Design a protein around this ligand. Structure first.
Ligand SMILES: [Mg+2]
Lengths: 120, 479
């Protein structure tokens, strides 16, 4: 993470309107084990975190959860990428050089609803 | 001659894979067809040997068999399930390994003078026969192997399990924790506890080839239900209640859901198995009283108490009288402390409508009209009074919708016989109805649900549930 990050310096206001945009610097150690869903092709029109697996790197960092949106990977904006494109960009920028990965994420806000109703 | 039970009237010489090994086993690079604590370096069968890359898995299977039987020359602590997963998982995926697994087990059961090892070997054969049969060529040898060893505790059950698995087809998942526990106890009979919505449970007899529908058939007879159409088994695991597929093998379903829960929400996870109504199609309260008093009332009551329906003060007083009667029968002293009980009688959105003593007085007056009713009659009266509501017999979801600016951010969704219902959480009014005839498509992710009729997009962790119910309702309505 970086405190001095300003999303307005990287995005136009229309791209971040209503989003809580933060920068995460994740240290490259072990497997990322960060699953994605969505894509420009999908109903949600954005790349979001579908799961964070127990093993770590993403879970070990603590700052990334299911529902958070991936907006940028190592400075490249991925908001208009398909799921395959986002997946490829995330796998590439993890293996291909660098001791760390820079993720710009739109943190999903608190759920003001019961997201775990179990009745049938 | 698979169809026949063979007898000579006397004990026959113990059948081995010696003669079979001459034709179908590869050359030895102690007999290759008899017990050995030495790990295999190559697969037993000529078929498997002729295929490189299947060598490593065949050797890893033998090491896991040695470890399960206690023949591996160490004590580097292994949980049983990991060993059984190593023995059977890839064999289910690659059927060429299935005869290899049988031959490796039968080999370790041949001329094995170590009783503990031999006992464990029979547990492996018992688990194996419940998953897949030997091939046409191996079947008479495996059958004779068992037939000449009829006095072994698990031997007659192994013979029956081969007949069963040939009839119903193979399992998709390796042995479940429950199957392994029974095997390690040398017990062939298993009962799994099944929970019901009315806070009761039953022990249900299950075997390796039991399908979810077979358990349901046994439950309908046990509960004296007129039908179980639209009911199923469900697994309550982590903070989820997931339906089980009726046509799936019970032990396959348990593993598949547990695996799905592990990847979608990250040891063997604790769980409960419930039998409940899933689809609420043609539900006529009073038609099947056992179904109404065991299932229907107890599933509809908590949805009512959550305040999902639009109902008036007078509706709540009337239903609270019936609910009090259904729970307490003749005991009029349970409304003594109104804060300790009001949440069990009145929907949570309506409790503020009057004071504690006003609720107590109105409920008692209503309840007093049911003196001549039985508990069962009160439960049926409750259901008859609400069964025509458009939100009756529904699954509910609270979501954050992002497709309709005219609606509040958070909405309530009901999935039932009428299709998909969108409800205002404050007023309980029906915003709109998406009937099955108008729904053209739907999809889901782990964070969303989308529907096209005229589009609905929402944030939810329950898209998989919504998808499954829509599919289930659509499949049922078509023919
Ligand atoms: Mg008043």
């Amino acid at each position: 993470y970086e405190e001095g990050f300003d999303p307005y310096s990287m995005f136009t206001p229309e791209q971040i309107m209503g989003k809580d945009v933060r920068l995460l610097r994740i240290k490259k150690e072990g497997s990322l084990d960060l699953a994605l869903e969505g894509g420009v092709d999908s109903p949600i029109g954005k790349v979001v975190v579908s799961a964070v697996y127990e093993r770590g790197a993403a879970e070990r960092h603590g700052g990334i959860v299911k529902g958070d949106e991936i907006m940028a990977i190592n400075g490249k904006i991925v908001t208009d990428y398909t799921l395959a494109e986002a997946d490829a960009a995330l796998q590439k920028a993890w293996n291909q050089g660098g001791d760390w990965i820079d993720l710009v994420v739109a943190v999903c806000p608190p759920k003001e609803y019961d997201d775990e109703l179990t009745f049938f | 001659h698979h169809h026949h039970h063979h007898s000579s009237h006397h004990k026959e010489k113990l059948h081995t894979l010696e003669e079979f090994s001459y034709e179908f086993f590869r050359a030895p690079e102690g007999h290759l067809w008899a017990y050995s604590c030495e790990p295999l370096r190559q697969p037993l069968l000529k078929r498997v040997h002729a295929d490189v890359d299947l060598w490593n898995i065949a050797c890893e299977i033998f090491v896991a068999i040695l470890r399960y039987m206690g023949d591996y020359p160490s004590r580097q602590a292994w949980p049983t399930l990991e060993l059984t997963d190593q023995i059977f998982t890839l064999a289910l995926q690659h059927p060429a390994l299935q005869d290899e697994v049988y031959c490796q087990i039968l080999k370790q059961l041949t001329h094995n003078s170590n009783r503990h090892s031999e006992e464990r070997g029979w547990q492996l054969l018992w688990l194996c026969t419940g998953l897949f049969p030997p091939s046409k060529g191996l079947l008479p040898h495996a059958q004779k192997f068992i037939d000449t060893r009829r006095g072994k505790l698990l031997a007659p059950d192994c013979s029956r399990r081969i007949q069963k698995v040939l009839r119903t087809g193979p399992r998709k998942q390796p042995p479940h924790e429950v199957e392994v526990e029974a095997a390690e106890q040398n017990v062939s009979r298993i009962c799994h506890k099944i929970y019901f919505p009315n806070d009761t449970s039953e022990m249900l007899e299950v075997v390796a080839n039991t399908r979810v529908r077979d358990v349901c058939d046994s439950i309908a007879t046990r509960l004296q239900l007129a039908s179980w159409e639209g009911c199923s088994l469900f697994i309550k695991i982590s903070d989820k209640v997931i339906s089980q597929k009726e046509g799936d093998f019970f032990f396959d379903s348990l593993r598949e859901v547990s695996d799905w829960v592990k990847k979608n929400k990250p040891v063997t996870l604790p769980y409960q198995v419930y039998f409940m109504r899933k689809l609420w199609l043609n539900i006529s309260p009073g038609k099947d009283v056992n179904a109404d008093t065991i299932l229907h009332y107890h599933q509809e009551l908590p949805k009512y108490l959550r305040g999902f329906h639009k109902c008036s003060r007078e509706d709540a007083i009337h239903l609270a009288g019936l609910i009090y009667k259904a729970q307490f029968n003749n005991d009029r002293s349970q409304l003594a402390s109104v804060p300790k009980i009001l949440r069990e009688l009145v929907p949570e959105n309506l409790t503020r409508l009057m004071s504690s003593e006003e609720w107590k007085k109105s409920i008692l007056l209503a309840y007093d009209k049911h003196k001549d009713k039985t508990v069962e009659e009160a439960k049926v009266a409750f259901l008859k009074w609400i069964c025509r509501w458009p939100t009756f017999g529904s699954a509910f979801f609270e979501v954050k919708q992002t497709s309709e600016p005219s609606y509040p951010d958070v909405i309530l969704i009901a999935i039932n016989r009428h299709g998909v219902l969108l409800i205002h959480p404050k007023t309980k009014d029906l915003l709109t109805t998406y009937p099955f005839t108008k729904i053209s498509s739907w999809s889901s992710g782990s964070t969303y649900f989308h529907m096209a009729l005229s589009r609905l997009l929402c944030e939810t962790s329950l898209g998989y549930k919504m998808d499954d119910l829509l599919t289930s309702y659509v499949q049922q309505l078509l023919s």
